[PDB]
């Protein structure tokens, strides 16, 4: 009748409150209120911490499982190392057949912007950016010629489209690809436009329909979390097949599912299934 | 277990099933498709845990629903789906006796 | 699960209500004459588990006598090995002072209580031929001297299993297994109403008033498709009707 | 009557004189007085089947373990109701209790005599019991006019037979005793009447 | 994270290049070890 | 509690370096944690999601359910009239 | 039969349209939408009972009075957009990305791989369950020995109208047997002959 | 006449085969020459044909006639044994019922008016008329395609037949101790998909506790289906419904192909001290949410 | 929660009948092309 | 085994045991809605053995 | 598992190829769950024992299951001196040897368990090998429409073998008759009495001594005749699918005919490999005469 | 309710129900 | 599953299951050739 | 039923197994007797012994 | 087991369901709509564990079975060696 898990069967000075059962000792009415008040903060903050330790995510209980396994005695101090190891290496590209030149990132300082930039590519030609002739007319936007380049391309049957490169345009392009509704994207580092690469299945398109959320700049759409769930519930059934693009206020372009999963709402930006 | 639901064929009253008046019968109620129906507490001999408590949280199609339209315009007699009455008689019977 | 000097050996594990605190027992011997289990008392703080649901580690903690000599702590969870279905048991935790519970060296003499047995399949051991049925306490409801067959004479047994050839046999109480993907594949399943759940899955007869003409056009012109609502009604001039529980991926018909 | 418990002598209609019925609703029909019968046996059966399974269930007012008085109260109630094999089924399952076996629980004489009152007044699904009454008009199909409707010393040897016939059904073949085999019948006593 | 291991997914075909030209494509431990975790995952998807 | 909510705020070793210790050197206190809820706590137990539960099967057939009498189901035609009869049931 | 040269089908598994789908036949502009409950038009929500839906609702040219209006035209939008309708397993395809309503059948995979610890991951050490044929074996025997070969552990005469065990099918047959195939064969042509 | 008929096989007497059939069916019967007659029946065969046969002949009518017996005592009789079969004739008829008359309940069609009719019809002159006229209609088509019994002719999955099944597969080894006998072993038999092969665990022990005549184990399809069992009440709990989920009510989202790598490595890399311990049945329970989904179905845990 | 009850779904039509499928399609409930080998 | 199989087999169904049985209903049971969970599953030999 | 499952295939091939006789699906993977059960009760013996590995002499010890399963682990002091890194990667050895023996143990037990897999599969492939009506070609002879011809290739090197005697009534049966003859014979014989009286008989008598366990022990209580099941002469599947339905009887005939195909497949691609080991095949193909001249 | 069981269907002795 | 197998029975004809469970088989001539002997339920026919 | 009947006798004929080319008969890319070939060496061989 | 010499004259007609109607030339109700337009109220199959004091399915079941039986003459004869 042996056990395990206990290496001690018992405590032989551990007992109980209730098995010594001695005469209660009050010092005063104060200290028992102090003892109430402080029992009863201490199981409050027990609570909350099983709580917060419940409704910890698996990327924070993973890394914190990795600290701890990695944990050594000493805090161990950081060592000299060749002069360079972590550079962020240039993505592939070939330099003969391109669409664009792969600009390796040690040329930032040569690099311009959108509304300016630097002599590049050459040997392509350069898209414009769009501008509005009179008042009347709507005020285009590059998330908006974007979008509807895109969806010509798609309808032509189009293998790669060149397009506007802006820090949305390459979040949404960024978002598009996790999804699977486009087959690649790149960022050559060119100022004006980046490459997209598009994607087919049993003839037709795999990208349905694409529409930009605001059609001028001048009118600007919030999305509220509320209105986001509304999205994912399809009539008492969870939805995810279309995709919604939304700018947060930490410059983070991210798709509707996340911003419901850490509640946050930003501006949209188009919506694509 | 399933909770009592509201909004059915034996919880709703005449007016709410048929917007007509129907005997309530313990027996013989071809109308509710029972043969005998006698009726205990409702609660006494089942067991409480198999009591779940009731569900009200949709709309009766049959007696309210949104956007009560006509279904078809013409002929003018069909009206929306929530309205299934029979036809009224006419001279229907009268009383001698004052009362 | 063993015999060996005739009592039943079983291992077991206790854990707490949320299955975080576990110890294992390799040997305990069942004993039906102990009302309910005893446990030592060091386990009460290696078994509280102060869960979200239970604020402190057992909902019910109190002090009996066995003077105020153990404590009733639970509830707790209990797996034996021979059993399928956990036990949630209240035992009595003693100290040392009123009980040691080491005899020899590294056994604990933990026995198991008729409480844990009579929740679990071991409760058919105390029916007469069972083995704990011999260490039954002395009762005038129970004679452990007399051997099986003459309690079940007394009861009322003369024969053997359906000896007799008026009672059936026991293995032809169900000759046949009903299995949809096995035999004539799944089942044509509709409904008439608000949801599959909620409606029935009867269509109605020939008899009703707005099918009878449909049904009268299509006897007449049996040839040709005739148009109206006699195709909702399970009368179809296709030899398949249309009825709840048709196979319809069925090789044949 | 089984449903509203009101007398046949005095009234007709099911909850007559009696202020809460729920078997008259504002605009309802008088619904008449039900007979007793095997259906409403079956319903006080259920009804106290659920009672009992209650009796352990509740938190409340159940008790851990069930009690002498439940269980001889549901033989009283089987016995009344004329449950001859759901009585004979209980008895059964009170032996085999693990209460019955700790003692708490005790078979008392008067439960084992309704018991036995039972089966003798009920009909049996083979045999003849004491219910059983001769009938006059019988004779015509029987050609008898006292004896009863049953041989058992014929029962027996049509039971031989049937079971020959099962051991031939389940072998295939038959297994024919020795020529010294005589069949034994010193035991049958012929069905005596009152 | 270091952008040394890319990779490519078709429908059901995923291509894994290594893009290391100033080392002449040499692995480190941490490329090494990305490397491996990316060719265990690559081989052991659904779609693979 | 979410982003709506007021912000919450923010040489050697630390104070709270010295409480922790490497899993791999024995625990202070011999707790008897079950094995499954180590692994689980972790992020290493084997998930068992729910989506990897398919169909839920009839093992046994549930019965027969009958034609049950109604007013559109009658033999003859007399007694569903529009005076009388307003629907099935 | 113009009908039946043009009838469509839908994937049923879905119940309903999961997407807002937009279109338009001859002008008239058609949208398909997730509803709780089969909401449309008399006609249309007719026309998608009959196509099964349960979940669905449609809108032509918004308010009925909008045109073009005509029986022709609530029809072919109607069955235009029902056409035009993509399945929820067709686009998660199309997408390349596994639907959440599949990946239980990945479960016995995933539980044969956490059950090959042990001793279900051992193979024999020697043999690779590969055997080639090195050399070659007969045992065809001649009829007489074949006629003797059993008379001790089977029956006498085991090959005794054997068509293909024996050489000779008739071998070892008594004048029963034989008589009864020959009379059989000689009698089916019995007034030809 | 069911007494003298379909019992009392202790007169009952067929056709005695001469010696030259005795010794052919003895040869084809303990071992089968290729291409051999197979219009040979088995002597079962031949009394269940017989008795087939005396139960179609009857005809009721009256008594003193040539009928047998009538339809009063036909019903009489019947009604009679309903009347006192019990609970356990009871379920053994209601097995009988949905094995041989439900199916033909479904597959029943009009056209076969005239048979259903005849199957105990009173013998007047129109049946004879309809029997002509189906005698017709045999000569037009099939005699064998046109009636009842051969519509049920052909089933899915021969490989795993009913019949083979009824006998369940290493039944004593596995009673003798249920806890060395997880699913996966006896499931190791069958060559079908994972939910099939558990129902025909759960049907093959229900079939062996039937014949032991013993309790059977009622919450067995809850643990071959725990995370169905499960899924079904999560389900329930977020869609305000009661019943079984179906694939129309099913969330819709679509996971990268390689998505299942975060589990697949714990599971490959997963090790355990028995295998007991890797098997065990509750590995699916983690919380107290799953603990009481599992365990809210029965009170008295 | 999803207060959308998914009990209280569709409209009765009268005596209109509608299929609603178990799990799968009826087309995909058995796979006898691949179960028995028959693929080229 | 024998005899626990035989005192499993008669607390299940007595009936079978007699030479002429009686009717044979379904009764209460001692151990709630739940005795399965106690009586169920033949008699169990020793896991030594 | 992977080559019991081979055995199978190819054994249900030949079956079908020889004698045009069909197993049924369910005996086809009887055998596989079989073996299966077999090992996981090797795995249930295995669990209960232990097993050392050690490390850096006697420095770490690491105690285990031969499954690998973590239960125990001995450092000595001057061990922890070492940084984290060290000591991970000797526990790592420690533990590494330590499955290098559960690996031994495993692999020996794995044999014995395809040896008993072997002895069970022997029945089926003598009925199949042992009658008068089987022979087989040599690979290398030409196949045409009427018969095989036979190519030279060194005839008077090559020899066809028989395995069935021409003698009447030759049969495993009659060998296991002849043994229990014998060793009954033996044990009457004078010197019988003292044998078995001798810790031999009693030994031998405990163990081949069926016939002696006491009712209700567990094993055999008597002592067989090893399986008789000829193909040719017994049906197995066949007769009854074609009686039931032809598509089925259709369908497990295409079974039975891709499983040989693969088989052979196989065969022929380890005799590939075996000729480019050896040196006598080139490793892209150089002779089309004998694959487009057909 | 008896009457049910010894009577042809079609046939009805007196529709109109009066003596 | 994309392209599913459907009913690949052939113990009766395409014909005769047309016959036996479909509405299509009493009228051959308003059915086209591509869909002779293909379907298997009652057809209900609405003139708009 | 000349297509049912087609199917099934060439389902049936149907050979399998390892030809003089080491191949199935079915091989995607060589065949096996092109034009009778196999048919016109039977004819000019025979079998005279 | 109780037994009378009793003559029933008409057996009745068979429970089959399938029998031609009494056809109508003209429709009380020559409205289509109401057919598709009808609704009533929803049919809650399980409500509390479905306990009656009387047991209403199985009941109604087993006598549906009973009369089912007695016109298929207990199933036997139709069915044959397959
Ligand atoms: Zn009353």
Known sequence: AKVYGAVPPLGAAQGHRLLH????????????????????????????????????????????????????????????????????????????????????????????????????????????????????????????????????????????????????????????????????????????????????????????????????????????????????????????????????????????????????????????? | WAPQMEWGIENTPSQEQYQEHVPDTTDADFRKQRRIQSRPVKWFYESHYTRTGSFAGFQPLRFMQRRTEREVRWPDVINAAVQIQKRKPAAYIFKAIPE | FRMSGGDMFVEYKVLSRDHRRSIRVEDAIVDPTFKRTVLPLGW?????????????????????????????????????????????????????????????????????????????????????????????????????????????????????????????????????????????????????????????????????????????????????????????????????????????????? | ??????????????????????????????????????????????????????????????????????????????????????????????????????????????????????????????????????????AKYTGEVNKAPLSPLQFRIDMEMNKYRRQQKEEGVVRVPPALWRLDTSAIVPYKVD | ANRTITGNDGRFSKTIMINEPQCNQALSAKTASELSKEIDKATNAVYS | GGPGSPVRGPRGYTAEWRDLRNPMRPPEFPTPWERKYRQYARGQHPSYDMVYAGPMPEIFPMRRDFRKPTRWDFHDIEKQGKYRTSGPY | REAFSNIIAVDLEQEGPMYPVRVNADGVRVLLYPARRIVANFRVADILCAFGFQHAGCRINLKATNNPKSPTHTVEGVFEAVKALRSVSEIAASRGKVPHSLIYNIYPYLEEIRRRKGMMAMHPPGKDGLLMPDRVVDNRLPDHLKRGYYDDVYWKDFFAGSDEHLNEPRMGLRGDEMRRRLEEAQTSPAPTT | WYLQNILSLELLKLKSKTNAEKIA??????????????????????????????????????????????????????????????????????????????????????????????????????????????????????????????????????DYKVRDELGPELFALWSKAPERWPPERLSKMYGLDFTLVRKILVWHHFKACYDACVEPDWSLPKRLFALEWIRDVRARKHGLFYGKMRFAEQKITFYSDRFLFRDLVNRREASYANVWEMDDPYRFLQTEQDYEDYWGDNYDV | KNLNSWYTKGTMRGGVPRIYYAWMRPGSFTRRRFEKMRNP | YKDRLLSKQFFQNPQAFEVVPDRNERSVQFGGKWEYQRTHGLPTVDRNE | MEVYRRITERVRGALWAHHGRLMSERQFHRILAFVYNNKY?????????????????????????????????????????????????????????????????????????????????????????????????????????????????????????????????????????????????????????????????????????????????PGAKKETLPLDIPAPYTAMDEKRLLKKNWMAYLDNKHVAEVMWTRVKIADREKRQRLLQETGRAWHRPINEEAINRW | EYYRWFIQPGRHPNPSGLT | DLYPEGFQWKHKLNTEYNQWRSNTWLTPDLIPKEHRGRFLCNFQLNIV | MGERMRAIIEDYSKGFGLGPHGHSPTHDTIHYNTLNAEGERVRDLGYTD | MKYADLELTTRGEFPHGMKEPAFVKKLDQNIPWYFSTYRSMYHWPITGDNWSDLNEAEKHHDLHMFYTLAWWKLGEGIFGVD
């Open chain 4, 1 to 138: 009557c089984p449903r509203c418990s009101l007398p046949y002598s005095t009234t007709r209609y099911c909850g007559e004189g009696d202020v809460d019925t729920p078997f008259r609703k504002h605009r309802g029909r008088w619904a008449p007085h039900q007979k007793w019968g095997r259906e409403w046996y079956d319903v006080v059966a259920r009804r106290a089947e659920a009672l009992w399974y209650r009796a352990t269930e509740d938190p409340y007012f159940g008790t851990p373990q069930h009690t002498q008085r439940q269980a001889e109260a549901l033989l009283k109630v089987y016995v009344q109701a004329k449950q001859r094999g759901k009585a004979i089924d209980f008895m059964n399952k009170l032996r085999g209790s693990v209460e019955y076996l700790t003692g708490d629980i005790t078979i008392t004489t008067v439960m084992q005599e309704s018991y036995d009152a039972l089966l003798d007044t009920t009909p049996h699904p083979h045999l003849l019991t004491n219910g059983f009454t001769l009938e006059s008009d019988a």
């Open chain 3, 44 to 253: 009460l703080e290696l078994l509280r588990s102060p869960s979200l649901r239970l604020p402190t580690g057992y909902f019910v903690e109190e002090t009996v006598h066995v003077e105020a000599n153990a404590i009733i702590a639970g509830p707790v969870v209990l797996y034996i090995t021979g059993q399928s279905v956990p036990v949630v048991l209240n035992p009595y935790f003693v100290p040392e002072g009123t009980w040691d519970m080491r005899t020899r060296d590294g056994e604990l003499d933990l026995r198991l209580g008729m409480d844990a047995i009579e929740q679990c399949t071991l409760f058919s051991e105390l029916r007469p031929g069972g083995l704990l049925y011999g260490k039954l306490p002395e009762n005038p409801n129970v004679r452990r001297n007399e051997s099986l067959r003459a309690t079940l004479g007394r009861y009322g047994m003369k024969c053997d299993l359906a000896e007799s050839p008026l009672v059936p046999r026991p293995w032809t109480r169900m000759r046949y297994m009903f299995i949809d993907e096995l035999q004539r594949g799944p089942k044509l399943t509709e409904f008439v109403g608000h949801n599959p759940r909620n409606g029935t899955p009867w269509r109605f007869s020939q008899n009703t008033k707005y099918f009878r003409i449909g049904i009268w056009r299509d006897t007449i012109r049996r040839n040709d498709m005739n148009e109206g609502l006699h195709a909702h009604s399970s009368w179809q001039k296709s030899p398949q009707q249309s009825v709840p529980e048709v196979r319809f991926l069925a090789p044949y018909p």
């Open chain 8, 25 to 158: 069916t003895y040869r084809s019967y303990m071992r089968s020459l290729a291409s051999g007659k197979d219009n040979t029946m088995s002597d079962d065969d031949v009394i269940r044909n017989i008795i087939k046969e005396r139960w179609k002949t009857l005809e009721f009518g009256d008594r003193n006639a040539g009928y047998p017996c009538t339809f009063g005592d036909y019903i009489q009789f019947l009604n009679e044994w309903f009347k006192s079969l019990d609970e356990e004739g009871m379920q053994r008829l209601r097995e009988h019922f949905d094995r041989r008359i439900r199916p033909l309940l479904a597959v029943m069609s009009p056209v076969d008016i005239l048979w259903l009719e005849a199957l105990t019809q009173n013998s007047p002159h129109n049946k004879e008329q309809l029997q002509r006229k189906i005698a017709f209609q045999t000569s037009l088509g099939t005699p064998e395609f046109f009636d009842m019994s051969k519509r049920l002719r052909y089933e899915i999955n021969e």
């Open chain 1, 21 to 273: 059962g001695k005469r209660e000792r009050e010092g005063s009415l104060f200290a028992v209120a102090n003892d109430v008040k402080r029992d009863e903060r201490l199981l409050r903050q027990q609570l909350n911490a099983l709580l917060e330790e419940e409704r910890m995510p698996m990327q924070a209980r993973l890394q914190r499982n990795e600290a701890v396994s990695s944990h050594e005695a000493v805090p161990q101090t950081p060592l000299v190392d060749l002069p360079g190891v972590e550079r962020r290496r240039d993505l592939p590209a070939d330099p003969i057949t391109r669409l664009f030149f792969q600009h390796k990132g040690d040329h930032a300082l040569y690099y311009g912007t959108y509304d300016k930039p630097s002599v590049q590519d050459d040997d392509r030609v350069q898209i414009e950016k769009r501008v509005p002739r009179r008042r009347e007319e709507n005020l285009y936007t590059p998330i908006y010629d974007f979008c509807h380049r895109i969806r010509e391309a798609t309808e032509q049957r189009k293998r790669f489209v060149v397009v506007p490169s802006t820090i949305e345009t390459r979040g949404c392009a960024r978002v598009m690809h996790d999804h699977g509704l486009v087959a690649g994207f790149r960022d050559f580092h060119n100022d004006r436009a980046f490459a997209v690469e598009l994607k087919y299945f049993q003839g037709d398109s795999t990208i349905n329909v694409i529409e930009p959320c605001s059609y001028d700049g001048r009118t600007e759409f919030e999305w509220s979390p509320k209105m986001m769930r509304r999205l994912l519930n399809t009539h008492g059934i969870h939805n995810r097949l279309v995709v919604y693009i939304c700018r947060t206020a930490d410059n983070r372009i991210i798709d509707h599912i996340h911003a419901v999963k850490e509640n946050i709402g930003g501006r949209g930006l188009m919506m694509v299934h």
């Open chain 11, 41 to 217: 009760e090797y795995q249930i013996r295995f669990d209960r024992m232990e097993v050392v590995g050690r490390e850096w002499g006697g420095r770490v010890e690491v105690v285990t299951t031969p499954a690998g399963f973590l239960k125990r682990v001995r450092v000595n002091p001057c061990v922890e001196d070492l940084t984290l890194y060290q000591q991970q990667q000797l526990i790592l050895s420690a533990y590494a040897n330590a499955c290098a023996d559960g690996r031994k143990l495993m692999e020996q037990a794995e044999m014995n368990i395809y040896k008993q897999f072997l002895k069970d599969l022997k029945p089926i492939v003598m009925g199949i090998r042992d009658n008068p009506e089987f022979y087989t070609v040599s690979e290398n002879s030409i196949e045409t429409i009427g018969g095989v011809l036979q190519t030279g290739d060194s005839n008077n090197l090559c020899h066809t073998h028989r395995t069935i005697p021409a003698a009447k009534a030759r049969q495993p049966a009659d060998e296991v008759r002849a043994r229990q003859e014998w060793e009954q014979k033996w044990i009457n014989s004078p010197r019988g009495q003292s044998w078995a009286l001798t810790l031999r008989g009693k030994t031998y008598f405990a163990l081949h001594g069926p016939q002696y366990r006491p009712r209700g022990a």
